């Protein structure tokens, strides 16, 4: 019943639309925000569409569904990334803007340089799957960064790169020392 914690990064590489159409906003702070659920769909899809190359163990066990007749539960929970303190300075510091609005109907983006701190928490359900489900959750991530977040992504916009991965065991004493994403 141990938890592993997964935090890093996402870079913002080509400008970042998530819903003239504004992007989506933490109401606390009204800066940018990356929802989990966006993240989690993206991931699930593209994961899915992998191993399709009718729902697969290893897509249900990690993500969960909403969908008709399904019981598993999610062993990844994702949180919303949230924009950087780093993030916040630096741009603040060196008069950067955070967003800008472009022609296609008038779209804001969150702009290119722009980092967001994330975090999943792994639910160690099954000890003997943990491996297999990180590579699976690495493999997800390629993908999505090999790909596109929000709209635009067919025009280039959405790339964003995951790095500074962190892995630690923050509940029960699994041992998670030889995990690695990348
Ligand atoms: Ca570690
Ligand atoms: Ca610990
Ligand atoms: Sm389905
Ligand atoms: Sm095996
Ligand atoms: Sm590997
Ligand atoms: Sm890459
Ligand atoms: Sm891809
Ligand atoms: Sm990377």
């Given at each position: 019943?141990?938890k592993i914690?997964?935090?890093?990064?996402?870079?913002?590489?080509?400008?970042?639309?998530?819903?003239?159409?504004?992007?989506?906003?933490?109401?606390?702070?009204?800066?940018?925000?990356?929802?989990?659920?966006?993240?989690?769909?993206?991931?699930?899809?593209?994961?899915?569409?992998?191993?399709?190359?009718?729902?697969?163990?290893?897509?249900?066990?990690?993500?969960?569904?909403?969908?008709?007749?399904?019981?598993?539960?999610?062993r990844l929970?994702?949180?919303?990334?949230?924009?950087?303190?780093?993030?916040?300075?630096?741009?603040?510091?060196?008069?950067?803007?955070?967003?800008?609005?472009?022609?296609?109907?008038?779209?804001?983006?969150?702009?290119?340089?722009?980092?967001?701190?994330?975090?999943?928490?792994?639910?160690?359900?099954?000890?003997?799957?943990?491996?297999?489900?990180?590579?699976?959750?690495?493999?997800?991530?390629?993908?999505?960064?090999?790909?596109?977040?929000?709209?635009?992504?067919?025009?280039?916009?959405?790339?964003?790169?995951?790095?500074?991965?962190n892995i630690?065991?923050?509940?029960?004493?699994?041992?998670?020392?030889?995990?690695?994403?990348?």
């Open positions: 019943y141990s914690k997964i935090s890093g990064t996402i870079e913002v590489v080509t400008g970042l639309h998530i819903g003239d159409s504004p992007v989506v906003r933490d109401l606390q702070t009204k800066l940018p925000i990356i929802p989990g659920s966006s993240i989690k769909g993206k991931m699930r899809n593209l994961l899915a569409k992998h191993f399709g190359l009718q729902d697969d163990e290893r897509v249900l066990r990690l993500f969960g569904s909403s969908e008709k007749g399904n019981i598993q539960r999610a929970q994702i949180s919303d990334a949230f924009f950087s303190e780093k993030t916040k300075e630096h741009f603040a510091q060196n008069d950067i803007a955070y967003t800008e609005t472009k022609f296609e109907r008038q779209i804001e983006r969150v702009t290119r340089g722009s980092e967001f701190d994330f975090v999943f928490i792994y639910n160690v359900d099954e000890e003997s799957q943990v491996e297999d489900d990180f590579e699976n959750i690495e493999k997800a991530i390629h993908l999505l960064e090999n790909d596109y977040l929000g709209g635009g992504g067919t025009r280039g916009n959405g790339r964003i790169q995951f790095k500074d991965t630690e065991t923050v509940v029960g004493e699994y041992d998670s020392t030889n995990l690695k994403i990348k």
